[PDB]
Design a protein around this ligand. Structure first.
Ligand code: AMP
Lengths: 331, 331, 331, 331
């Protein structure tokens, strides 16, 4: 017969069900950065890519497949049709609406809701037990949208939130102190972007609190302008976009880190976006970044960080704003 | 009174001299794919990026730096000035001229020569003991150019050649046979691109020669059209460019694989482009892909593959053509 | 309340089931080598250790747990009771009886049967869907025993067979040729130990068959004594025992390699022990090493290697001997 | 002539000089655990093993070599003669004298000095630029001995100190809180063993100080007995020795972690043993564990942890005792 039949003797015709499947939605720069980072960390036995642009999609898939020899992820698949995403343990959403000049913020968000209205039900249909990881911006709001539309319990809908911002923060701390980011500890919480909260009290190296050694840390009396470091974190995003057009690599790595905690059930603590109703006097259905314990069931626990009245107020303000927008959305 | 001084007691203001530095020249899609793949394989303690576009360069560097928390490569640097590349063990060249519409092959190469005339001397100036790995196309010719201009001994100038083409080939074999690419063996040699030579005799799984089981393999009498698989490997590159605009990920992975053999002195055999004068009756200064042993000093040995008179002639033809062009170049 | 309650806010109550659990039976040197190799390759989210010696068991567990900071396997457990092995995807058996002076082959095997009669039913009880990987010697026979007692279908009972022997063989060929073992290809098949079959025809580097370049390869006319290399592979085990008392590291690495193919569904080809009834004119229920495709469902396919009449006869001889013993066993 | 010559065409006869060589001294359980951990983390391109027991040494080497296919460290060597250790970047010392019953502390140390008087000069002779990492106990004293005998500057002589003790501590914290050890932070400082200092003030999760939430933490008024966790860390070593006879795995992993920081120049902070004269009012030449920044030149910086008068006194006491012994030693 065929060569295959002359060479290989088959013992078992069984249809495969993947054990550790991950799906990435959106094959723009961010999606592809997430994909490659995941592939290089051996987190999945099957990777699925979905987008609306069929050509780009197929091309990215082929490019990855050609590298199979150098990978340990035996199956990479793609398609416009969400059936290819079946049985994902984790689905990462990077797709969004592309911005129009002169469009209001509310309008942009609504257009994303309309996109998610197509995406989410299709995801849930084929992977009813998956965890959702939302990366698209604005992340805290779109994580809420995905939660609402999916009908999943809140532990299973996760926003990337301030994971990357905290990583940037630690990198910058490390630059100033001459130590690796891994050994600098610091937390950025709340709303992703301009209104994030740097928790000065918690900043340390080897368990030595910086605020104790330098009490003006994070104030304006601060002659070393540490307050600037936080501003720098917020600005660096735009700085990079101004320079190369967009951001990709850092987000990809940050997302893969989250995926690792989930796929391996590590129960590490990450500053990620979860529903916060009932904490710090927040009474609305909003998602904000707090330190969360992350594992195979998504977010199981939250760490209660002790905040100053100023910081606590800053969070409530963010919650009010987010709710203000969310209440205006048409589902 | 400064915080750093209150926290850290310094023992040494030592000079950074990096031990395992890698430089990537060119921060287009291919360059950046090489960079990220290298970063994720912990091959270097310092990575340098060089290009002519300062904005793009700086942006890519920052994006990578922001991910330092998730990496184990403590120093990432960039610049227009080649001084930032000093003391590289390995320098990867991805820069080049893009071909223009209806442009003659000789003309295209000459334009690249002019670019390399600036790049190579600067590289050699700051890293006189490095190995050069050329990725730019056309790779066999440009590897020759780099060799000529660098004045390095031939063991230290390496072209990526048919490394990726062979990897694509094995992937496709694996698809047809239902086994991983890792367990399919096959070699594509000679000139990179449409005139590559698939060595049918050497194709095997578990040491079982396919040509023995299916004697018409690779001919036109072949009713399974295995000859098509080779055509497919050649077409793949264009197929992907047509679909997504360019090729990146697979090259990045293939290059990182080569970097691994070099940085860790593995002495694995790869189908890569080396100077072949003196083999298969080739008497000209030409580079073509043959199976090479790759280690810390570059290419130390070559494996003498037994070729049919047809295959051998095909190689000589390629050598003649390449020399025909090379002899016309203005250095 | 407690500190834990003041610090952590719980969102989700539930007792969890591990997704990628591996169990190792036997915590002698071989078992522990398998364990450490598996832990360092991030193959499992939970690792279970079982043995009869409760002290040694608990001590090994604790020692490993203390290293959890440096690992990515969050749960390590142990116990005399097999309930701790529940929900394993893969169970690796290293326990067994050591042969006595003057003791017949049949007697040795029977003593192991008696041990397996306790182990296997307990394993299958708590992990009815697992794959069994038998490492204990004599491996081909004990793999049969485990199959018989488990009542599992044959694709799911795997013997480590000649995986390590082939790896040793490639290492030795690499030493002689000056290339890495990864680039030397060679297969040792059949019965593990002194009756193994080195398949000379299939030995190659870069697809160049050594038998073609050196037709006396593997004969006694062979002035380079390649036949000795195979003898060396057989003797290696004893050589190492004579020197350091026992063997561990290489087996551990070889087993982890198999585990990787299974846990990641790679469908790589390994020379491992599977039931061969129906191949090479073998009509009995025996296990021998042949090249097998290994994936998430165990052994799905076998590669039909073309053997010389001598080689084929050698296999049949081994099958006859094994059956001779197996038919006498008391279950 | 030979098959090798018919198959491989040599282009380069060069001398091998390893780029990232590591030597382990002592092939007892601890040494071998360090070796395997290092091999599995791809930290070296050459690994050397040295001990006085030639048989055990050779056997361990061979066992490792047989696994070469599954490793990416191409050269593993061993010998009684220290010439095999030439050009090591890092030398790890695990050899030492085993205690005799009723032998005084001073006597035991002196016997180790006599051993180190043979080892260290030989190490320094062949690898004059290496860093020394001392693991043997008592580590703080023997690190001093090695420093004295080597004549190296102090940044290059490192004791493993409380690295593992801190790792155990974090594991136990994690067990109590239901979070991974990676996300629990805590430091054990000073003299390795019974007199270590747990720094309660610095203990945190996500930057939330436990001492702030539970002010009696670490006292006897502490109804949760956190003080016990420290006792547990000290006892666990003996507990494991009672159970298995010795400790191996955790030390091996801890050491490999340090090796990673050194070989990759990460500048992470570890609690390791360095010379402390001039800090906390210590005026003698003694080594104790404090948080050190670790990189390619060894210890570049030390973090000044803020200590209570009790803690500070505890350290001075330890310094006095160590000096008491050190001043009696015959070099
Ligand atoms: N616009 C296009 N972009 C990319 N590939 C194309 C295009 N048009 C045709 N091709 C295909 O690319 C292949 C040519 O080989 P190569 O240039 O080596 O990729 C043929 O199979 C063509 O059909």
């Amino acid at each position: 017969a065929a060569l295959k039949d002359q060479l290989i003797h088959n013992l078992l015709k069984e249809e495969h069900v993947p054990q550790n499947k991950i799906t990435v939605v959106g094959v723009g720069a961010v999606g592809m950065a997430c994909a490659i980072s995941i592939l290089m960390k051996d987190l999945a036995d099957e990777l699925a890519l979905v987008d609306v642009m069929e050509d780009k999609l197929k091309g990215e898939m082929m490019d990855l497949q050609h590298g199979s020899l150098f990978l340990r992820t035996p199956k990479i698949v793609s398609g416009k049709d969400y059936s290819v995403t079946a049985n994902s343990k984790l689905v990462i959403i990077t797709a969004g609406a592309r911005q129009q000049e002169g469009e209001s913020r509310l309008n942009l968000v609504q257009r994303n809701v309309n996109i998610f209205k197509f995406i989410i039900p299709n995801v849930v249909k084929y992977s009813p037990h998956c965890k959702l990881l939302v990366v698209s911006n604005p992340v805290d709001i779109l994580t809420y949208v995905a939660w609402k539309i999916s009908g999943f319990p809140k532990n299973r809908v996760i926003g990337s939130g301030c994971n990357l911002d905290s990583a940037r923060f630690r990198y910058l701390m490390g630059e100033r102190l001459g130590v690796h980011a891994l050994s600098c500890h610091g937390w950025i919480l709340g709303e992703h972007g301009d209104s994030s909260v740097p928790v000065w009290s918690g900043m340390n190296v080897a368990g030595v609190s910086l605020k104790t050694l330098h009490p003006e840390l994070g104030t304006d009396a601060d002659k070393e302008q540490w307050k600037q470091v936080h501003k720098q974190v917020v600005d660096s995003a735009y700085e990079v976009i101004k320079l190369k057009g967009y951001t990709t690599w850092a987000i990809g790595l940050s997302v893969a880190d989250l995926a690792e905690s989930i796929m391996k059930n590590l129960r590490r603590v990450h500053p990620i976006s979860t529903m916060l109703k009932g904490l710090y006097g927040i009474k609305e259905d909003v998602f904000l970044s707090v330190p969360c314990v992350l594992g195979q069931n998504g977010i199981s626990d939250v760490v209660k960080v002790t905040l100053t009245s100023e910081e606590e107020a800053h969070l409530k303000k963010s919650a009010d704003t987010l709710w203000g927008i969310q209440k205006e959305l048409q589902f």
